[PDB]
Amino acid sequence: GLFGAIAGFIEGGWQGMVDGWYGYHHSNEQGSGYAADKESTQKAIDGVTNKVNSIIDKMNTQFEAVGREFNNLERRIENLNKKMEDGFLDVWTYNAELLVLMENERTLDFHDSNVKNLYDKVRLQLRDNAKELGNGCFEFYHRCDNECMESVRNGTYDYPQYSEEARLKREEISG
Amino acid sequence: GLFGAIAGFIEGGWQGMVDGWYGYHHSNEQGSGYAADKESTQKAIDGVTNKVNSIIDKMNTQFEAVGREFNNLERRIENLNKKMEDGFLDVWTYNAELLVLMENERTLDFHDSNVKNLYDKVRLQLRDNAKELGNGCFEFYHRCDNECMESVRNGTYDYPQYSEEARLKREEISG
Amino acid sequence: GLFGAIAGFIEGGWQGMVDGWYGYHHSNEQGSGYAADKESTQKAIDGVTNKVNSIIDKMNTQFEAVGREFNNLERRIENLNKKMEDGFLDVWTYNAELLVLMENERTLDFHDSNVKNLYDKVRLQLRDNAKELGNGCFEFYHRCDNECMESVRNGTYDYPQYSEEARLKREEISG
Amino acid sequence: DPGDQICIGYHANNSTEQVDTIMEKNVTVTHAQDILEKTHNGKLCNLDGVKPLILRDCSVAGWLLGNPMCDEFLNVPEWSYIVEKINPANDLCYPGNFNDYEELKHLLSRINHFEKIQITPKNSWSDHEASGVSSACPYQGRSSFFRNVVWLTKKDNAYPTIKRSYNNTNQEDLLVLWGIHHPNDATEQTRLYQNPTTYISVGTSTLNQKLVPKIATRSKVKGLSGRMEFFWTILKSNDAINFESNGNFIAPENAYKIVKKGDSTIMKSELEYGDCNTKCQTPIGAINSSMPFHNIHPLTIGECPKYVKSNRLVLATGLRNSP
Amino acid sequence: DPGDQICIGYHANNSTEQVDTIMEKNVTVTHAQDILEKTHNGKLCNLDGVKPLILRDCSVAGWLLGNPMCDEFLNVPEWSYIVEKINPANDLCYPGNFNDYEELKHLLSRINHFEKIQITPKNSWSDHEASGVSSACPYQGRSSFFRNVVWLTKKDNAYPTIKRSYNNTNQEDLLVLWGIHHPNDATEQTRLYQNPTTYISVGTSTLNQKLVPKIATRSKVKGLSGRMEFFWTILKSNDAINFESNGNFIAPENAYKIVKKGDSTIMKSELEYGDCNTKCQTPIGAINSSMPFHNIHPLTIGECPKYVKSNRLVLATGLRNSP
Amino acid sequence: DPGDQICIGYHANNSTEQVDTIMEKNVTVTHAQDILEKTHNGKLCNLDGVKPLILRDCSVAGWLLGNPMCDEFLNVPEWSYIVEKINPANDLCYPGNFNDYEELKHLLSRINHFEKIQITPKNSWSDHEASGVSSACPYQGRSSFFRNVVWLTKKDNAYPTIKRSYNNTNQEDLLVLWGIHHPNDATEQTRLYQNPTTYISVGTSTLNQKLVPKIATRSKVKGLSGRMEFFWTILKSNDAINFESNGNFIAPENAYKIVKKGDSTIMKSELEYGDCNTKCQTPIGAINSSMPFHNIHPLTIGECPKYVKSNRLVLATGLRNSP
Ligand SMILES: *[C@@H]1O[C@H](CO[C@@H]2O[C@@H](C)[C@@H](O)[C@@H](O)[C@@H]2O)[C@@H](O[C@@H]2O[C@H](CO)[C@@H](O)[C@H](O)[C@H]2NC(C)=O)[C@H](O[C@H]2O[C@@H](C)[C@@H](O)[C@@H](O)[C@@H]2O)[C@H]1NC(C)=O
Ligand SMILES: *[C@@H]1O[C@H](CO)[C@@H](O[C@@H]2O[C@H](CO)[C@@H](O)[C@H](O)[C@H]2NC(C)=O)[C@H](O[C@H]2O[C@@H](C)[C@@H](O)[C@@H](O)[C@@H]2O)[C@H]1NC(C)=O
Ligand SMILES: *[C@@H]1O[C@H](CO)[C@@H](O[C@@H]2O[C@H](CO)[C@@H](O)[C@H](O)[C@H]2NC(C)=O)[C@H](O[C@H]2O[C@@H](C)[C@@H](O)[C@@H](O)[C@@H]2O)[C@H]1NC(C)=O
């Protein structure tokens, strides 16, 4: 994609995440598990639905063909009528197909932007209290249970609360 | 947004900033204050203005309906004429609304991209001479009058010129 | 650009790089030189070439004008015929010009994206074994020959394999 | 020791649905929405509750003029649309043509109900023979003629000038039909109408018409080389129509009150009634769908999706899917 | 202790202007530009310096033929466009029809100025009476007739054959008008024209016409059962027109030189002159704007915005605005 | 001392090609693909292997009726398309008109080859003179006439009634032409045709036509004030056409079998043949290109790019180019 998140710096999708589009996998002493970011997926399901409806609403006024008949000496206006009717069908066929191709592209990049934007939402919370592995994961420089994890999933993660604890762990590695 | 800048990792705009679209807020002993980045706002006013002119100009030659009259045994051609003229008004109405809906979307994503590119313009200058707070602000690691701020606003900021004061301060936090 | 790579945090293009669109310039004891990114230039050639073809075929069915003649007392259907054909012609000209204008925009920003994602492909490999100069360049914290240079080009760069060689060098600077 | 870690990722599943994009085709995605209806039931149904007028092998002329082989339609109820075949078998039984036929058919597409009324009783022609018939218009093994017009001929050996007027005293506008006979030679002319040179005048507040027979030799169509030429007018409520004639007159017998105007169409289909119901009908089958597009036929009537020529039209709602 | 700090941010204000986008409606933005003109003055104006030809209750046919109730328009100056009502009251005072009226009207929409000339002095009919008059054509409470054609009838008890010719010696093309009278019975025919069997021949380098009256019974329109049928031609410069008739002839008295062609149209409007001026006119009011779009009426004349059916069209220039 | 470095960057070159975008015009780019063909060879060529029919100063009417100046086209080979000038000099040599001409010209756009057949040998007029000739149709300094129709006049002092019939026994449809002559006065009528009151009846399974001369005064066109009006019909395979007349008949001599149907058009061009070959032809030159668009002319025939009004149409393939 255009942002490097989906099928980029974070490879592959999570079969086991069935609750949403974007989210978190955690691994501490209380085992593993998946959890969806409700805020970033509700914004995304509402964004895509509005677009889909916005595509349908733009085609409410569109050309409708009607049958007209002509005698054997009205071949010129019969031809004028056929070209005119095929002409608009081609125009609206082009307009729909192009609208589908164009928004499909921007929907996929919407999902790409949303995942990378979620990554940087967590990356700016941990700072140096965790290390960027470069595959979408952060290895903490301290202990993080299942309410600390919850604090970063809802963005309440208070930094200095683990600042000193982590610093000591960094000094052990740089020795 | 698609970039996470406007209403993203930095929410809300600066009401007190009246000189441009994007810029800086600074706070040292020499009081506080705003300063607009005119360079990044000038590229953007030129960018948006050109777009507006390019959409209006692409529709200068467009379908115009003319009154034609038909008698009572010409209802077929009268109907052909009516369907054709409505037909083109609907095509050009669709073309105008859709062009607005699409470029409005891309006008907004143009702006956070300009904010994000500008954020990364100073972030890539200070590096470890500053700490990223993660909300659009940097509390840098040294002393800056109102000409130090000037060097980063125009991108002439020499790194080692203040690396040591910061280095000691990094060592001071490392104490 | 919309992503800040081309004509942004990395100024200018490389006249001396002739093998591809995006790539690397290296400087070790074994001299300097340019080298193309093989994987990323084909994905981009596949991307632009396919788009070019999808634009040509989305206009394969389009309005074709035909000659029609009318006598002196058919001015109304003569005029209707003229408006109908001029009308479809104006519609298809707009569709062609606007499709080109809109995809030109998206082609240049695609390039901007491909360069930035390539930047992040090596930045997340080297981490602290290198210093981001902030101009698109990385100065290593160790010695890097011409099998080290290729190793970062294939995403085979082993981080812990020489982290210590690098860690001591930072502390050598950190003294 | 490697410690606690939190990772960011996205949904993936076993979906196989593909989607097209400008730069890449057949991109597999987690969730997609089809917006193109591609299926129909292959039958002609009622539109909302209203049944179409299904002409069998009868054409609009056969119905309106009263081809004896179309008596099924002597008095049709309100219809939702008209169905006619491409080459109807029971059209003009006597050879000839219908004047401004296509403008008539177009008027019909704005009409949902006719009511037939008799405006000249066959027993009101006391100085003419009102019994013209032809072997080209058989009814029940015998020669007949159109039912809604009457073929007048000479009685004894005379054809007095007919001066007849009819006043549309109804509230509704009237569709009135009539004709003129073009014989093959002066002998046949004198046998049927006596008078060698004849005319027909038709007068209305707007119509000011004069017809004259074209007595001439022409090809046999269905064994006849004579021709019948028919005409029509809409007699407005309270206006009167005037006929003056000394031969070759195919006089109006029945006329049509326009009872209800509205949306209708004349569909060309070979299909037959289906005893089903729909809100969207095409000549090749009806549509029941909530998708906004379809590609089955451009000619539809009712509440319908928008026609497009596409074979496939799929929207991406979800994200790109991993192998 | 907290040291020196720098923050990077963007503008916000008290703006309430909303903008639509594909994925989101009603996005408040700092700066927006409206590009859709939605207002007009509700008047009929001059187009540049030029006044329209405003027919009041007169139709185009009423004007050109010279309906006595249209004497306001005997010699009109150059116009910018023509305004006509939906159902003008003063049309053909005498009942009948205007042949090829719509093709005449379309020619008229390509013309900016006529100059009326006399092509036959009314005192040149020395063997016919040229004072024909009708109660369906009142002028001052009395019977009159069209001013641009003359109703010829018999003088003494004869209608000598008219053989009259006119050569367009002018440099401009001539619009020439004439008619034929259709009486209701043979007695009126002889009362007006003496000759029972009459014709009208008209000849040009291209016109080759022969009319024959239709004497017949028909409905009363405005107390009359007669009809007048009018015809028109464009006589090219240096060409001649030739008339022959032995009765029922409504002869040309005045004709129109086509002095200037250009863009105009015939607008249908109930409005009256407005004593204003514009660069852009619609049937329901004039437009003074620099907007690139408008939604007031699809039929405009002059330098105008582009018509669209949109109720609203707002462009986003600024940024998303914070609550 | 400073160590090893790796840099990520992009291509640049000395290219100058500019490209347009929504926000900025003339952005210089490294690689572009032009897709707009703007050139033609400026001549009339063959389409595939097949030569066009280039009428020189002849019109389609002049060709089919057989204007003596169009003997070059008496038997033309199969054509790919037809080239005719805007105002061809050799048209209807005798003044008059061609009935439903534009509908005939339209029929012509699906015909690639005629094969002319004789339907009445000129030596079958034993009771009429078949030698009508006119100074309006000169051939080699002398009065001649159309070669495909025959001007019959009285013989001795009689014009017996003509009854001639033809049954199209061919597999292909037939184009049949005939005409009527309108004299200037009753004296000329009896001088040429003896009978003062004349007719022409033409009959087909579908045609039922009756013409009568319009004897009247008209302006001289090419020194003559008489007129000839021509008519045409398509006689289907196995149908018959019937002609009856007692004067003023311009009789069919030759008719056309429609032997090959296919795609064609009538192009209006002043150009002449070019001895080249093309796959795509326009009225002002041929197109040899691989471009998907072109801008030379809207009327093309064959395998062509799509017409657009654009002056420039360039795609960006490479990236923005550095100063
Ligand atoms: C046009 O001519 C056809 C062919 O003529 C017949 O065959 C010839 C080889 C020769 O023997 C002629 O003298 C023959 O009549 C003719 O069609 C034929 O008509 C006969 C009736 O006598 C039929 O029995 C025969 O089947 C038929 N042949 C074919 C191949 O159709 C047409 O005459 C009649 O044709 C029939 C089909 C009807 O259309 C009828 O109205 C018509 O009289 C003849 N066309 C016309 C308009 O006269
Ligand atoms: C058609 O028949 C109706 C019914 O009689 C006629 O209308 C009536 O005419 C009488 C005058 O004799 C009048 O007093 C009635 O008020 C009127 N009734 C209605 C419902 O209109 C009509 O005759 C006449 O109609 C009037 C309106 C007028 O147009 C006149 O020209 C006409 O003769 C009959 N129509 C015709 C054409 O005779
Ligand atoms: C209409 O009147 C004009 C004015 O007299 C005629 O044109 C003149 O004709 C004479 C010959 O009779 C010629 O010497 C003059 O040069 C010519 N004047 C002009 C300005 O062209 C015209 O008569 C004749 O015009 C010529 C050109 C030709 O068409 C001939 O057939 C025609 O009779 C008059 N037109 C008619 C139709 O009578």
CB pair distance less than 8 Å for D219 and F239: yes
Quick check: C68 and A83 CB within 8 A?
A: no
Q: Which atom of ligand 3 is nearest to the CA of F220?
A: 31
Cα maximum dimension of chain D: 127
Q: Give D91's contacts in chain F (Cβ within 8 Å).
A: none
Which CATH number is F51-271 given? 3.90.209.20
Q: Which residues of F touch D219 (CB under 8 A)?
A: 203-205, 239-240, 242
Q: Is D169 in the pocket of ligand 2 (CB under 6 A)?
A: yes
CA dihedral of C107, C110, C115, C117, whole degrees rounded to 10? -170
Helix (H), strand (E) at residue D54:
strand D53-54
Confirm or reject: Cβ of D13 under 6 Å from ligand 2: no
Answer for the pair E10, B111: CB distance below 8 angstroms, yes or no.
yes
Q: What span, in angstroms and rounded, lies between the C-alpha atoms of D16 and C168?
A: 51
Report the pocket of ligand 3 as residue ranges, CB < 6 Å: E 167, 169, 238-240; F 219-220
CB-ligand 2 contact for D240 (6 Å cutoff): yes
Minimal CA separation from E211 to chain B, in Å: 22
- Distance between CA atoms of residues E280 and E273, nearest Å: 15
CA dihedral of F1, F4, F8, F14, whole degrees rounded to 10: 80
DSSP state string for F154-168: -BTTB-PPEEEEEE-
**D220 alpha carbon, distance to own chain's centre:** 27
Q: How many CB atoms lie within 10 A of CB D182?
A: 22
As a residue count, chain F comes to 323
Residues F53 and F78: their CA atoms lie apart, in Å, by 8
Instruction: Tell how far the Cα of E217 is from the centroid of ligand 2, in angstroms.
Output: 16
Q: Are F158 and F194 in contact (CB under 8 A)?
A: yes
Using CB atoms, pick whichever of A69, A109, A124 lies closest to residue B9.
A124
For chains C and F, count residue pairs whose Cβ atoms are closer than 8 Å: 191
Nearest atom in ligand 3 to F221's CA:
31
Instruction: Classify residue D228 by burial, with Cβ atoms within 10 Å: 0-12, 13-18, 19+.
Output: buried
Q: Can you give the C-alpha Rg of chain D in angstroms?
A: 30
State which ligand 2 atom lies nearest to the alpha carbon of E219.
Answer: 37
Amino acid at E180: I
What residue has token string 């311009």?
A: F250
Question: What contacts D323, CB < 8 A, 6 or more positions away?
Answer: none
- 3-state SS, residue E108: helix
Nearest residue on chain D to E182, judged by CA atoms?
Answer: D208
Contact D315, D27 (CB under 8 A): no
Q: Could you write out the DSSP letters of every residue in B79-108?
A: HHHHHHHHHHHHHHHHHHHHHHHHHHHHHH
Q: Whose CA is nearest to atom 41 of ligand 1?
A: D220
Contacts of B24 in chain E (CB under 8 A): 6-9
Q: What is the DSSP string of F279-313?
A: SEEETTEE-----SEE-S-S--EES--EE---S--
Place of tokens 């019937």: F242
Contact of F150 with F230, CB cutoff 8 Å: no
How many other β-carbons are positioned within 10 Å of the β-carbon of residue E186?
A: 10
Secondary structure of D103-117 in HEC code, one letter for each residue:
HHHHHHCCEEEEEEE
Separation of alpha carbons E166 and E254, rounded Å = 12
Beta bridge partners of E141: none
Same fold yes or no, D1-50+272-323 and D51-271: no
Question: Separation of F152 CA from ligand 1 center, angstroms?
Answer: 30
Query: Which residues of chain E have a CB within 8 Å of the CB of C75?
Result: 103, 106-107
Instruction: Name the experiment that determined this structure.
Output: X-ray
- Distance, CA of C141 to CA of C170 (rounded, Å): 7
Alpha-carbon distance E131 to F179, whole Å?
42
> What is the C-alpha separation between F151 and F163, in angstroms, rounded?
16
Residues 6+ apart with CB under 8 A from B155: B121, B125
Does A10 lie at the interface with D, CB-CB under 8 angstroms?
yes
- Secondary structure (H, E, C), C111-157: HHHHHHHHHHHHHHHHHHHEEECCCCEEEECCCCCCCHHHHHHCCCC
Q: What are phi and psi of F9, to 5 degrees?
A: -150, -175
Those residues with Cβ within 8 angstroms of residue A175's Cβ, 6 or more apart along the chain or in another chain: none
Nearest to F55 by CA among F34, F76, F27: F76
Whether E218 has its CB under 8 Å from any CB of chain D: the answer is yes
Considering only CB atoms, which chain F residues are within 8 Å of D179?
A: none
Q: Which residues precede gaps in chain A, with C-N > 2.5 A?
A: none
- How many residue pairs from chains B and E have C-beta atoms closer than 8 A? 187
CA D158 to chain centre: 40
Strand pairing category for D273-278 and D44-47: parallel
Alpha-carbon torsion, ordered D23, D26, D31, D37, to 10 deg = 110
Tokens read off for C111: 């390039």
Residue whose entry in the numeric block shows the structure tokens 């080699």? F140
Considering all CA atoms of chain B, what is the largest pairwise distance in Å, rounded to the nearest integer?
100
* CA F235 / ligand 1 centre spacing (Å): 15
Instruction: State which residue of chain A sits closest to C47, comparing Cα positions.
Output: A1
Of A147, E172, E7, A153, nearest in space to A138 by CA:
A153
Among E2, E8, E314, beta carbon nearest to B118: E8
Quick one: how far is CA A116 from the chain centroid? 9
φ, ψ dihedrals at A163, nearest 5°: -65, -45
SS3 E272: coil
**The two structure tokens encoding residue E246:** 């032995």
Query: Cα A163–A167–A170 angle (5° rounding)?
Result: 140
d(CA F305, CA E259): 44
The domain locations on chain D are 1-50+272-323, 51-271
CA distance E183 to E181: 6
D25: contact with C, CB 8 A cutoff: yes
Helical (H) or strand (E) element with D82: strand D82-84
**Does the CB of A103 have a partner CB in chain E at under 8 Å?**
yes
C73 part of contact set with chain E, CB < 8 Å: yes
Question: E272, E235 in Cβ contact below 8 A?
Answer: no
**Which among E163, E204, E209 has CB closest to F219?**
E204
Which chains does chain C touch, 3 or more C-beta pairs < 8 A?
A, B, D, E, F
User: CA angle D110-D111-D112, nearest 5°?
Assistant: 130
- Asked if C56 and F35 come within 8 Å (Cβ–Cβ), the reply is yes
Phi and psi at F133, nearest 5°, equal -150, 155
Tokens of F151: 């001007």
Nearest CA in chain F to C130: F5
Question: Residue B78 burial (CB < 10 Å; 0-12/13-18/19+)?
Answer: middle
Chain-centroid distance, C-alpha A96: 23
Specify the length of chain E in residues. Answer: 323
Burial (CB count <10 Å: 0-12, 13-18, 19+), residue F103: middle
Determine whether the interchain pair E23/A47 forms a contact, defined as Cβ–Cβ distance below 8 Å: yes
Greatest distance between any 2 Cα atoms in chain F: 128
DSSP per position, A89-135: HHHHHHHHHHHHHHHHHHHHHHHHHHHHHHHHHHHHHHGGGEEE-SS
Domains along the sequence of chain A with CATH = 1-175 (3.90.20.10)
Single-letter amino acid code for the residue at B97: E
Residues 6+ apart with CB under 8 A from B80: A68, A77, A80, A81, A84, C80
Ligand that lies nearest to the alpha carbon of residue D240, given by its number in the listed order = 2
List the structure tokens of A127. 């700072």
Does D242 lie at the interface with E, CB-CB under 8 angstroms? yes
Q: Which two tokens stand for residue E157?
A: 């008890």
- CA-nearest of B116, B47, C110, A94 to F21 is B47
Ligand 1 within 6 A of CB of F165: no
Dist. CA C5–CA C20, nearest whole Å: 17
Residue D29 DSSP symbol: B
Partner-chain residue, chosen from C84, C90, C134, that has the shortest CB–CB distance to B124:
C134
Check if CATH label 2.10.77.10 holds for domain E1-50+272-323. Answer: yes
Please check whether residue E87 touches B, CB under 8 A.
Answer: no
Interface check F87 vs C, CB under 8 A = no
The residue of chain B nearest to residue D233, with distances taken between CA atoms, is: B73
D217–F163 C-beta distance less than 8 A = yes
Cβ atoms < 10 Å from Cβ of F118: 11
D100: contact with B, CB 8 A cutoff: yes
Q: Which chains reach chain F with 3 or more Cβ–Cβ distances below 8 angstroms?
A: A, B, C, D, E
- Cα of F169 from ligand 1 centre, angstroms: 9
**Cα-to-centroid distance, B144 and ligand 3 (Å):** 100
